[PDB]
Design a protein around this nucleic acid. Sequence first.
RNA 1: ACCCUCAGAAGGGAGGCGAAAUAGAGCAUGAAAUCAGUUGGCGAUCGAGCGACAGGGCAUACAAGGUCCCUUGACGAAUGACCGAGACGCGAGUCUCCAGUAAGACUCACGGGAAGCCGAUGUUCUGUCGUACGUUUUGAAAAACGAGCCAGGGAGUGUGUC
RNA 2: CGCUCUAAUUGGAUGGAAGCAGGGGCGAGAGCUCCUGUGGACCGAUUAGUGACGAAAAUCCUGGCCAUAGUAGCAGCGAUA
Lengths: 49, 142, 150, 142
Amino acid sequence: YAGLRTPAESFGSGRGQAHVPKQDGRARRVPQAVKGRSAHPPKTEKDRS
Amino acid sequence: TELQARGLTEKTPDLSDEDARLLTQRHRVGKPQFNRQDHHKKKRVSTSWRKPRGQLSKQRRGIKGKGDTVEAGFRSPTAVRGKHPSGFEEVRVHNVDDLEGVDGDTEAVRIASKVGARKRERIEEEAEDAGIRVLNPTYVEV
Amino acid sequence: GISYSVEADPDTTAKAMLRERQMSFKHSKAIAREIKGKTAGEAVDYLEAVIEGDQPVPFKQHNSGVGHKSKVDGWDAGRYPEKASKAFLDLLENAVGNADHQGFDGEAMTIKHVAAHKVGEQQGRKPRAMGRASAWNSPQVDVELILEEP
Amino acid sequence: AEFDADVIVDARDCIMGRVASQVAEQALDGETVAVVNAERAVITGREEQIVEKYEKRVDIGNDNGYFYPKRPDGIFKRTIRGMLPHKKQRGREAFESVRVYLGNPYDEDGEVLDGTSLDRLSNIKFVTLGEISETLGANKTW
RNA sequence: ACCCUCAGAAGGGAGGCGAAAUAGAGCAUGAAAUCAGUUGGCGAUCGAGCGACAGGGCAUACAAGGUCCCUUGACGAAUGACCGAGACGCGAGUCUCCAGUAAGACUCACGGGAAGCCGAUGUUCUGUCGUACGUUUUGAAAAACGAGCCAGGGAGUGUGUC
RNA sequence: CGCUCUAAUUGGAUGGAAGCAGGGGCGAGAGCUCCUGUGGACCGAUUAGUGACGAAAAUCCUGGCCAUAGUAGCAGCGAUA
Ligand SMILES: [Cl-]
Ligand SMILES: [Cl-]
Ligand SMILES: [Cl-]
Ligand SMILES: [Cl-]
Ligand SMILES: [Cl-]
Ligand SMILES: [Cl-]
Ligand SMILES: [Cl-]
Ligand SMILES: [Mg+2]
Ligand SMILES: [Mg+2]
Ligand SMILES: [Mg+2]
Ligand SMILES: [Mg+2]
Ligand SMILES: [Mg+2]
Ligand SMILES: [Mg+2]
Ligand SMILES: [Mg+2]
Ligand SMILES: [Mg+2]
Ligand SMILES: [Mg+2]
Ligand SMILES: [Mg+2]
Ligand SMILES: [Mg+2]
Ligand SMILES: [Mg+2]
Ligand code: NA
Ligand code: NA
Ligand code: NA
Ligand code: NA
Ligand code: NA
Ligand code: NA
Ligand code: NA
Ligand code: NA
Ligand code: NA
Ligand code: NA
Ligand code: NA
Ligand code: NA
Ligand SMILES: [Sr+2]
Ligand SMILES: [Sr+2]
Ligand SMILES: [Sr+2]
Ligand SMILES: [Sr+2]
Ligand SMILES: [Sr+2]
Ligand SMILES: [Sr+2]
Ligand SMILES: [Sr+2]
Ligand SMILES: [Sr+2]
Ligand SMILES: [Sr+2]
Ligand SMILES: [Sr+2]
């Protein structure tokens, strides 16, 4: 759940802003956002044997 | 009272006529800079070469003036490719044991930068005696 | 902060510096530019003429909208920045002082070097319409001075 | 004010365009030319139409401006400038080393470049730069 | 610490400590954007994808590159003469012989020379070509879309089955 | 070609490692390497592996910064001080 612990929503079109989930004006969750989730991270479920 | 470099600084390798010709060719023909397109138009774009990939890219489309695009046709001659401009074949050396097996008539030696001043001294004297030129010599005052 | 950006022989030179001064950085370049080369004393008499409004300081780089001044020579624009000028007087006071405490002739000495450097901004905020606030900062200026025997 | 011309051309009874073409090439060859008797230079055609074309050049214009000469003086000079890349260093150099004069301010007598002569006994439809300048409204200083 | 300066527990100067203060308090290192000062080049008569490739100016401590220029000669691919002689054509000019000769890019040798001199680097001038980049599109310099600049961040991953 | 960490083999460093700055050389190129200065403690190569591995772009994210500009505002309200 890392980086997923936020209710950040995107403002959409309207304020010359890129559609990126923000919270308290801080961008997020999304992988390209600092403090966001990792897109394709290491996974426990992976069989490393 | 003056600086002088250790080793056989002036030593030249002995090449075949053909090699000497090709080396000379390489030096005369040279090659284009091959820097990434428009690297000069934006500071955030490094000089490091990247294939022009734009569908409309002027360079990719090969328009005269937009610079050459990397092709095998630009390779240097097999026979001299990679030689020091002197003609020698460089040998990366990290210690004295590395000098063993080197032919000073063809190869010249280059001491890794990491190698400290103490070990360079040994390596430099042992190399001279084996008749091997050291490309990056120490300059002492004599 | 800054460090003297120029070499100075301790036996024929005296130094001085201002630190984090809240005053126009733009006016400082103008003044530095203008007095460099002069004599400590000449410099002071000059800055006093400026603070007094009898001698304008040429604004060659930061001159948008600045009205022309007839006394400005070889140029048109600029003004009389008394605040920054005063800060420079404090610098020369310090410079000449040191110089003297060292045996030199403070005033007679030449302003070999003198440059201002924006060392930072003291940040402030100002409320605006529509529930928004914008920056309202103060420049922080450093300046170096080097006097040298004529 | 004195012009050490290497060459002095006599424009009198000569086809302007053809004289202009040679003085252009020569200037580009380093020659310093002086076209004399500009007012007596001649351009072929039907006077009415010719004058119509030069009047339009006088009427053309706007704030940017299209300054067009009326004196036979020079343009003739303009005719030459139009055969020279006058906006390039070399071109401007050539152009500035060419001067046109009303009458002949020299003691010598300009030569007549070959192929540029109009035989008045075999032609009725031609005009004189002076005649054009007069129509254009120039004050006949010459 | 002491001293000097200053309205001054500020700051500044000098000074002491330490291998180091350019380790003196968000105090290891200290990139880019960017600012001040300064150096080289250009510069108040001249034109705009900013350059690539050539070639000239000016500039350059050492090191890590050492070549470069002119006489002559040797070799000499394709190409390839002048002149002279003879013969055609109204003429521009052509043919035949001289002759596939002289010439001919690269490379080498002799002799002479260069050390800002050759390379290279900075900038600038000349020549040729040249209306970014990525995307959308039949068609983009586009009066179609994206970005003020820089740094760092930013997209084929796991399980099961075939 | 380059990046991380693992392993075997094998090397460099306080007689100065990595990094950074300017500069020299090699490679068609990804990129490799040397010199000088700074730095003051770590760094490689080969082979087999490992992958949270390569950015100019997304009105992309965060931080920092320039021009804008010494510019607009610091006048307007029946309370002109
Ligand atoms: Cl290959
Ligand atoms: Cl400012
Ligand atoms: Cl007009
Ligand atoms: Cl032109
Ligand atoms: Cl007629
Ligand atoms: Cl050859
Ligand atoms: Cl893929
Ligand atoms: Mg995170
Ligand atoms: Mg760049
Ligand atoms: Mg104004
Ligand atoms: Mg409100
Ligand atoms: Mg620090
Ligand atoms: Mg369409
Ligand atoms: Mg091994
Ligand atoms: Mg991309
Ligand atoms: Mg990255
Ligand atoms: Mg931002
Ligand atoms: Mg304005
Ligand atoms: Mg009142
Ligand atoms: Na939370
Ligand atoms: Na598992
Ligand atoms: Na201005
Ligand atoms: Na004036
Ligand atoms: Na004046
Ligand atoms: Na005509
Ligand atoms: Na006109
Ligand atoms: Na150059
Ligand atoms: Na698009
Ligand atoms: Na495009
Ligand atoms: Na368009
Ligand atoms: Na934006
Ligand atoms: Sr809408
Ligand atoms: Sr080293
Ligand atoms: Sr300005
Ligand atoms: Sr001609
Ligand atoms: Sr001190
Ligand atoms: Sr144009
Ligand atoms: Sr031959
Ligand atoms: Sr990634
Ligand atoms: Sr600002
Ligand atoms: Sr008021």
